[PDB]
């Protein structure tokens, strides 16, 4: 459902950071090596964590949103979560930043699970809107809440420069406040 990398959306690959495609039957995951923590890109077929696991897509959903495709990693509680959800929800952590797994939920505040996604809700999807965790519009003062994956397809996500050598602040904005 996304063309290039499904984590950062960039469509260009790079010599030491290539686009890697999952050969998983029924899987259309494509990610940069550096966007999924791939240790060594194989000289043949490669499989995303989900397609390597021992259960069918029916049960393998993200704990943090209602969207089904995209690049998943295992969580603390032996669940699953989008890499992009983990990036753009501030309190989500990674146990190992090199391999980018597992995704650590345990420090996610209760206040991220008691919101309704406005994008979902304007679509009239009241069950989906309450599912998972929401990020908050990065505009000062605005308290609009939305799934990371919903803002991704609405084109509402962005990587802004942060204080530090190469610190990225992964954030988003509601339709009112983008740039």
């Amino acid at each position: 459902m996304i063309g290039g990398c499904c984590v950062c959306s960039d469509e260009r690959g790079w010599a030491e950071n290539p686009l890697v495609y999952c050969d998983g039957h029924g899987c259309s995951v494509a990610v940069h090596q550096a966007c999924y923590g791939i240790v060594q890109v194989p000289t043949g077929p490669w499989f995303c964590r989900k397609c390597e696991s021992q259960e069918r897509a029916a049960r393998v959903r993200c704990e943090l949103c209602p969207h089904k495709d995209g690049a998943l990693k295992r969580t603390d509680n032996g669940g699953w979560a989008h890499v992009v959800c983990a990036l753009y929800i501030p309190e989500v952590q990674f146990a190992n930043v090199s391999t980018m797994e597992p995704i650590v939920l345990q420090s996610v505040p209760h206040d991220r699970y008691n919101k309704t996604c406005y994008i979902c809700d304007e679509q009239g999807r009241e069950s989906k809107a309450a599912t998972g965790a929401c990020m908050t519009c990065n505009k000062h003062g605005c308290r609009q809440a939305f799934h990371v994956t919903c803002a991704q397809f609405a084109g509402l996500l962005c990587e802004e420069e942060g204080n530090g050598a190469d610190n990225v602040q992964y954030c988003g904005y509601c339709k009112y406040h983008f740039s």
Binding site: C35, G37, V83, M100, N167
Partner: peptide, 9 residues
């Protein structure tokens, strides 16, 4: 090459 995760604030 630093991953997206390693760059997160």
């Amino acid at each position: 090459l630093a991953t997206k995760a390693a760059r997160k604030s």
